[PDB]
Design a protein around this ligand. Structure first.
Ligand SMILES: c1ccc2[nH]ncc2c1
Ligand SMILES: [K+]
Ligand SMILES: [K+]
Length: 536
């Protein structure tokens, strides 16, 4: 059977399959193309998805949601402690690990976060088996790009507990970019911005894509921004309008607030396609009908700070990627809140009128991409940065990865110590800040340097890659013309695509440590006479 793509989301999940040249997003038993990531425990039974979310107001302490915010984390994590305060269900500490604790069939029960997510995955797996008429065992599951190794491993465990063989865990922004065919471009590298406003979180990611390989350059966002915050601004507006018109505060009455909030969500969706929405609630409070309206402009005004606030993580991400906004080749809109026209207009104005990729249903695009990647797994540029070791074992890059071949790059270096008789040129490949974490390709010495104080002798190092892919590295003492050279072969099958992806992933994992190492370094043009990695 074909492998499925599963967007395991904070508030909802979505499953899709690539069949007959086309992705189909699979509707569940209620006919819905997404399924809430909720699990409810009752005296009679366990409910998953739509049934769970429907009865939440009736059974809030035994209805679990937001398990993705706990997955992979320790109880003591500051995120977990802050998030606990807002949840009606109990989270307890079992040997350093959080568990949700609920009453089920009269018995107190506790579940790890991955157990809860595995129940969501079982429901997704069942939804797909009903659609396909056959068992589903293979799946691609997505996670946020900022998930660390423990969160990724805990997501795979949930898939295993559910009986899925997880082919690969891939990042949500990568899924989205695959959905839009940005990997199939086959040309010079492209910078892609993924703008993901939905499922209770706001994530901005910048990716580079070249030769079928994705690298996450930077991520920013807000973990507690979503559509409910926009709806809440409307709710408080209408509570105030009711208090002003009828001198009554409906905040006392839980159901009244619930009815208003439901009306406000509906109006928000209307305002994405019309310039005004009608609110009609019979007997909202003390028998008073609440018939009114709201314009798109008022809704935008009510949310002005939240809407304009989404550009601050965009600016942050661009800074961390060391990119200007003009250097972004592709903008991709993911998440249900990106249907809001003011959001789209703010983003487009920020990018000087650049057209946005948004034709794929923004609620489904991540599942769309996972489904395509699952199908692939079922069935000329430099791959890695090139440089030499400078003083202290620092990787100093002469040719960034994704550089077009042929190419020639030269840089000038000096000596680290006084009267240094020679320098050791050590060629490395990789994306880490220290040579010890990259791959040594070759080394040669340039000796005969005339005695001089530190920093005086000038050594020019040249990296040349011809059309055949052979790398020639040479060094010249600029005071004498004496030189030395090494040739480095690039046979087919030296690096597999998997080897490249591994190197890229390690770079994304240690991006924090390495970027602070690049701030920490003082001189990146000094060369020593010994290999730093062989020094005791
Ligand atoms: C040797 C090692 C790495 C390389 N990258 N591109 C050409 C090449 C040659
Ligand atoms: K996901
Ligand atoms: K999001």
């Amino acid at each position: 059977g074909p492998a499925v793509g599963i967007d395991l989301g904070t508030t909802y999940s979505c499953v899709g399959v690539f069949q007959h040249g086309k992705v189909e997003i699979i509707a569940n038993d209620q006919g819905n193309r997404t399924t809430p990531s909720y699990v409810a425990f009752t005296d009679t039974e366990r409910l998953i998805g739509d049934a769970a979310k429907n009865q939440v107001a009736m059974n809030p302490t035994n209805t679990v949601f937001d398990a993705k915010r706990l997955i992979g984390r320790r109880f003591d994590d500051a995120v977990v402690q802050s998030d606990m305060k807002h949840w009606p269900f109990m989270v307890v500490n079992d040997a350093g690990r959080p568990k949700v604790q609920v009453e089920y069939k009269g018995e107190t029960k506790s579940f790890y976060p991955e157990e809860v997510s595995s129940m969501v995955l079982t429901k997704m797996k069942e939804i797909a088996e009903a659609y396909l008429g056959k068992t589903v065992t293979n799946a691609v599951v997505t996670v946020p790009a900022y998930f660390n190794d423990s969160q990724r491993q805990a997501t795979k465990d949930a898939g295993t507990i559910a009986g899925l063989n997880v082919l690969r865990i891939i990042n949500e922004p990568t899924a989205a970019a695959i959905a839009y065919g940005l990997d199939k471009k086959v040309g010079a590298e492209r910078n892609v911005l993924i703008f993901d406003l939905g499922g209770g979180t706001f994530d901005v990611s910048i990716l580079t894509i070249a030769a079928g390989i994705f690298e996450v350059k930077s991520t920013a966002g807000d973990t507690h921004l979503g559509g409910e915050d926009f709806d809440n601004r409307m709710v408080n507006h209408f509570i105030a309008e009711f208090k002003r018109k009828h001198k009554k505060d409906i905040s006392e009455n839980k159901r009244a607030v619930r009815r208003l909030r439901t009306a406000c969500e509906r109006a928000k969706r209307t305002l994405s396609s019309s310039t005004q929405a009608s609110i009609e609630i019979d007997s909202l409070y003390e028998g008073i009908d609440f018939y009114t309206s709201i314009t798109r402009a008022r809704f935008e005004e009510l949310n002005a700070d939240l809407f304009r606030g989404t550009l601050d993580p965009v600016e942050k991400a661009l800074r961390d990627a060391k990119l200007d906004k003009s250097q972004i080749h592709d903008i991709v809109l993911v998440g249900g809140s990106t249907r809001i026209p003011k959001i789209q207009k703010l983003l487009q104005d920020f990018f000087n009128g650049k057209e946005l990729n948004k034709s794929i249903n923004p609620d489904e695009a991540v599942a769309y991409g996972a489904a395509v990647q699952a199908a692939i797994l079922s069935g000329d540029v430099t791959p890695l940065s090139l440089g030499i070791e400078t003083a202290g074992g620092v990787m100093t890059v002469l040719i960034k990865r994704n550089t077009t071949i042929p190419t020639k790059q030269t840089q000038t270096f000096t000596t680290y110590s006084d009267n240094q008789p020679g320098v050791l040129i050590q060629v490395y490949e990789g994306e880490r800040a220290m040579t010890k974490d990259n791959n040594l390709l070759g080394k040669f010495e340039l000796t005969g340097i005339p005695p001089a104080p530190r920093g005086v002798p000038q050594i020019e190092v040249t990296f040349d890659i011809d059309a055949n892919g052979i790398l020639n590295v040479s060094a010249v003492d600029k005071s004498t013309g004496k030189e030395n050279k090494i040739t480095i072969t690039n046979d087919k099958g030296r690096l597999s695509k998997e080897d490249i992806e591994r190197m890229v992933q390690e770079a994304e994992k240690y991006k924090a440590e390495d970027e602070k190492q690049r701030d920490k370094v003082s001189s990146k043009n000094s060369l020593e006479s010994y290999a730093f990695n062989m020094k005791a």
